[PDB]
Design brief:
It is classed as ubiquitin-conjugating enzyme. The protein is of the alpha+beta class. Helices cover 34% and strands 18% of the residues. The chain has one domain: Ubiquitin Conjugating Enzyme.
Length: 160
Amino acid sequence: LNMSGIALSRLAQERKAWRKDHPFGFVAVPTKNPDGTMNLMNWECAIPGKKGTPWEGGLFKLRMLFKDDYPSSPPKCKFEPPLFHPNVYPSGTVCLSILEEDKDWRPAITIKQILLGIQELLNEPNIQDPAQAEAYTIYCQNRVEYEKRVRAQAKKFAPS
């Protein structure tokens, strides 16, 4: 077997587990190849904002990019479009400890965990590693304003 084999076998297993059971409102489906076949290395996901939070109502689109060395390596997660959030790079790339090899990544981590992890990050930013100057500054300087912009954002991404 090659690196990808390992990755693919795991991803396939991830898929099954997801379809079998997953948090309500969440979405996680592999993309299609130009030929209609599933591309397990690229997943289009959606994270709903948590009720009771300023994120409530929004459905945030995220892309999950897996490398050949997965699960040795974590997937690259990016919001599309990029979100206003202290831990999200302007590119849309999420900054989360579990998504960094040298940090908290563990091969055992599931898509489900990732997703839920991102969801919690949304409402609970990590002041320790700012990824977006703007959002970070506001977050610290004026939460009301921060909350105000977050809500607008949520509205902007509300389904219809």
